Amino acid sequence: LTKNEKGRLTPITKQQSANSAKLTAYGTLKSALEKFQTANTALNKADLFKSTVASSTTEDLKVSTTAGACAGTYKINVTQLAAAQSLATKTTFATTKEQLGDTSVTSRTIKIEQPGRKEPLEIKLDKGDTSMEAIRDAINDADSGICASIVKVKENEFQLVLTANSGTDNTMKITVEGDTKLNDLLAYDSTTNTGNMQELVKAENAKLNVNGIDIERQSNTVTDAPQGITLTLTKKVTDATVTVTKDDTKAKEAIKSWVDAYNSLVDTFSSLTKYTAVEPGEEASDKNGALLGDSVVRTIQTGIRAQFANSGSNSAFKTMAEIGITQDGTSGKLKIDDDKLTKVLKDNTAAARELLVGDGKETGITTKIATEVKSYLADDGIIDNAQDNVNATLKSLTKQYLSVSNSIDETVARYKAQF
Amino acid sequence: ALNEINNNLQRVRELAVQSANSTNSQSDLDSIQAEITQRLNEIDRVSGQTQFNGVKVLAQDNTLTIQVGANDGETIDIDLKQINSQTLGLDTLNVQQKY
């Protein structure tokens, strides 16, 4: 009866091992769809097709390019360079630890006002913070733009230097409230240019000329002069040239990664639907895929490959094959010929971008594939619904196993009594 | 057969899209006629090259119920639908335009 119950187990244990391999297959399927979804979403960015690269003739001017630039040639002439105001105290001090302000007042405040910032910056010095090092540390810890330094002009004499940021909107109007000696030491007014601190450097704006247009920025990093190219100025160049040329490398690599991900998904599905033909046909072969004949893989394949013909896209191309990617006859795998894809990316970049990326909401091959894979990979999707149905059947089977195990106990007792 | 016929679907979609507009020129359309011969060979491969139970059932149609496995009273009614050019109307597919 142990052998009889093992024969009873034969399809029961076969189904239990099949359910274990089916849970493994579901895990592998979810992992493959996760990787495919990651690659597909990586492709879903339209900014890859609008990409360029810029070069400059002069080593002084530095050029970089963001997304959305336009190809061409620009003649840059830099006339001025931005500078940052620096204020230095007049009275040199013996040591950096000697007290600067009056020790009678335990609380004082440094108030710095600029045209740039709207709320004036207040830095609070409590008792014992009237040393030069303490003022330096307070102003550097505020981290609001002003940068205090110390200069040793010669042995036993020091100065305090406060430097703002670049531009004419960052001129300082310093004040000290709560103290008198410190107010006598640190007090400037850039509106009337009169104060108790000398001005070592004068604030200036950065002026330049791009293709006959006069640009005036605050800092030496110009951003929106052609709206897509960032320029870093170092010296006063004259008639420098910047060349911006279209690029397709990022889009090409995204396409390669996407086709590789789809090929890996198809390979995993094909291996999961594996079968071996046996001539006698007495029983099913050992090398059988657990998810063979199930609606899961077939439905996923049909749904994914149906999106390659998308009616949402309004571009000139209606079939993805026109980009230069063809699906092989033997198996559902995609392969790319370099010439056609390169020509399409070079000439019809807009058409390819509209075909793949689409408007991002209800248009494009990639958007439809993304939403379909999201719906399938979700728990409410048909794939996880079938998985839950299988799990419920397995739970009912487990109850059946417990009942039949009670039957095993009864039958074992019966034959023990007989034998 | 489904892989071959979906490849054919993508082919014919490209064919109609390129023939409707001026993107595909008439020398390109002669190359498309070469592709039409190639996809006819594709149909011939899905029909003849593949085989069922040692026989080219995808090349010859036998719409008959299979013999009973003796495990059940009822017989399995398999209506074997071969992927043929003629009976399914696929042979009539030819999108070559007028010269």
Binding site: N4, G7, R8, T10, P11, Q15, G293, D294, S295, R298, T411 | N71, D72, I76, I78, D79
Partner: peptide, 27 residues
């Protein structure tokens, strides 16, 4: 047709093996 009929037929093969197990209990 083929796939769903033969999935139900794999279930029916399990049922037939269950009947054979019942016969083994009978034998």
């Amino acid at each position: 047709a083929v796939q769903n009929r033969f999935n139900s037929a794999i279930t029916n093969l399990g049922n037939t093996v269950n009947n054979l197990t019942s016969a083994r209990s009978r034998i």
